[PDB]
């Protein structure tokens, strides 16, 4: 068998990226061998969270009774080389027919969970939107996906960049520093972050004194030299794991000192940086974070676990390292699967102990139910607004404390007069 494939009455696509590789020119039109590249522990954890969710639903005799959920999952380390997997999900015979109707025609899968990053989604989503094939992303935070008319069958189980940027602005307004540097990844995620940041601070006392696109070619000596010359104390770093690590590692090496760092929720629960040698010297690290949401049964599931782009090559893996990895986006994966599973259940007009078998399921039928999702899950209420954004999930403020943990020191109030509160006593500057 394989981790990446599970047969079932209905299939869910799973789009993950559990290896990392920098973009490179290529000379042939062919998939990349992602299994020989850099392993990403926390992404593999979210990969397992989907496998766990499906298995849990298949163990249930009340949700989808006697109707099994299968999946085809992929490790797309390159968004541009992800199309073979995407075609597989959308094909009706290991064939794609470009003019095929949204109604008549039964694709391999009924919907797809993922992908993780905005870049991955932008490359592929239009092909899915065409026949209203539902995508429920567990990670995509680009604000442009809130535009229904551009992304009619795209939903997500995480917050948009606007929410996190509001929280970050909230953190800054709570203290006294008003010059700010903004280091953002040179990609769709980071650039949307920068625009939202500029928009939010424009009519405020906050001055954006320096900003810079972070990419593989970044000369960090000059970045920090420019920051230091402008006497900037607050540095926002809006960037995924690889770029956030490069920034912070470089700062340690270049003797950057006495700063106030602010992380987005993509690296404020990073597990490598808080115990890295010399981390203490760069100053204080604050962040917006996803609260740790406990997923009962997952620990047990993990002990018991350990076509192109369906190979892990991760066999000598420490169960403990995987368990303790950045658990961000966990409930978003879990809810994304459950949302599709409920949508199928209701589309089949399943009852309590059996589902009818006279109903033919089309992806756009799954979409209609998904949009009116309304169900409880680990005591949260899963729903999406008109734009397909989640109406669940909160954000908290964290401070990297002396024992290497991301201590909760505050929370972000989506709807209240003081939008962000912080117990300032907990922060040891």
């Amino acid at each position, epitope marked *: 068998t394989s981790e990446f494939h599970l047969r079932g009455d209905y299939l869910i696509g799973g789009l993950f990226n559990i290896h990392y590789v920098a973009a490179a020119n290529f000379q042939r039109p062919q998939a990349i061998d992602c299994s020989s590249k850099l392993f990403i522990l926390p992404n593999y954890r979210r990969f397992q969270m989907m496998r766990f969710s499906v298995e849990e639903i298949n163990n249930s005799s009340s949700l989808l009774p006697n109707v099994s959920l299968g999946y085809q999952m992929f490790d797309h380390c390159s968004d541009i080389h992800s199309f073979p997997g995407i075609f597989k999900l959308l094909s009706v015979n290991d064939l794609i027919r470009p003019w095929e109707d949204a109604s008549t025609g039964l694709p391999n899968a009924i919907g797809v969970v993922g992908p993780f990053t905005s870049t991955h989604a932008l490359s592929i989503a239009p092909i899915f939107m065409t026949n209203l094939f539902p995508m429920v992303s567990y990670g995509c935070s680009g604000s442009v996906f809130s535009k229904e008319n551009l992304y009619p069958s795209f939903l997500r189980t995480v917050h948009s960049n606007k929410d996190v940027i509001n929280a970050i602005v909230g953190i800054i307004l709570n203290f006294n520093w*008003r010059w700010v540097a903004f280091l953002y990844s040179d990609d769709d995620f980071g650039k949307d972050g920068l625009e939202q940041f500029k928009n939010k601070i424009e009519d405020s*006392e906050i001055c954006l004194a320096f900003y810079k696109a972070i990419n593989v070619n970044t000369d960090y000596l000059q970045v920090f030299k420019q920051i230091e010359e402008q006497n900037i104390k607050v540095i926002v770093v809006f960037a995924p794991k690889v770029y956030a690590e490069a920034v912070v590692e470089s700062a340690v090496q270049l003797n950057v000192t006495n700063k106030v760092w602010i992380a987005d929720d993509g690296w404020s629960l990073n597990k490598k940086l808080p115990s890295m040698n010399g981390i203490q010297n760069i100053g204080t690290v604050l962040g917006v974070a996803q609260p740790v949401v406990t997923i009962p049964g997952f620990t047990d599931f993990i002990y018991s676990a350990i076509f192109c782009n369906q190979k892990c090559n991760c066999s000598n893996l420490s169960v403990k390292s995987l368990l303790n990895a950045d658990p961000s986006f966990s409930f978003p994966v879990y809810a994304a699967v459950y949302a599709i599973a409920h949508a199928l259940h209701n589309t089949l007009r399943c009852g309590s102990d059996r589902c009818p078998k006279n109903i033919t399921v089309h992806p756009h039928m799954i979409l209609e139910e998904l949009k009116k999702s309304n169900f409880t899950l680990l005591n949260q209420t899963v729903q999406f607004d008109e734009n397909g954004d989640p109406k669940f999930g909160s954000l908290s403020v964290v401070f990297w404390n002396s024992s290497g943990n991301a201590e909760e020191v505050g929370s972000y109030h989506f709807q209240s*007069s003081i939008h962000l509160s912080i117990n300032k006593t907990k922060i040891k500057w």
Partner: antibody
Amino acid sequence: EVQLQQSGPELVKPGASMKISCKASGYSFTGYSMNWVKQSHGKNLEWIGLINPYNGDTTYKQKFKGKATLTVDRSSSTAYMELLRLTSEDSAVYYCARSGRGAPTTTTAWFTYWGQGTLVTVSA
Amino acid sequence: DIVLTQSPASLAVSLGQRATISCRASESVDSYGNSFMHWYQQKPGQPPILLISRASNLESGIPARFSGSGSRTDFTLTINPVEADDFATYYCQQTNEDPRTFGGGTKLEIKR
């Protein structure tokens, strides 16, 4: 454009208290400190303190601690200063003034917008 | 607390001529590579108006006739040429450290 509109002149008895208002319009209210300034008949200008209307944090000049109390009402975009236990020494014009944009810290901000000022007469 | 002393306490300057006004701080008002001394103009019965921030930066709206210079503890406001409506009291203000303080002001009279 930005307007700060203070409440009108007030006569108040010695010993009483009173609350001056400053209604802000034409900008995002929680984005900037609101400062308060005292000017006695001798015309010396004197910083009373400021409030962060985002969260209500206050910073006072020491002699006005327990004499002045700054608050905001975010729902009406209005800053308030309450003066306590008035003496004839509190007779003065009081201004509100918004911090500008460009200073490195809330401490270093200069005053770009001013209310028209509120004359307070403390007499029996 | 930073004490600001202005001089002269008052001066009279003819239409078309140069007004020089200085401000001395008891301690340096520099930080962040800037000098945090500002100049304000006030007419009787009116709120002060900001002329110059950070020693020498002219606020928009304010005539080029006004300019400032200095750093650390010594600062100067120049009005040139003086016009008839420039009669006012001029105040320096330091914002380098809490509490913000103002000088006692310099009263400019138009000479005729």
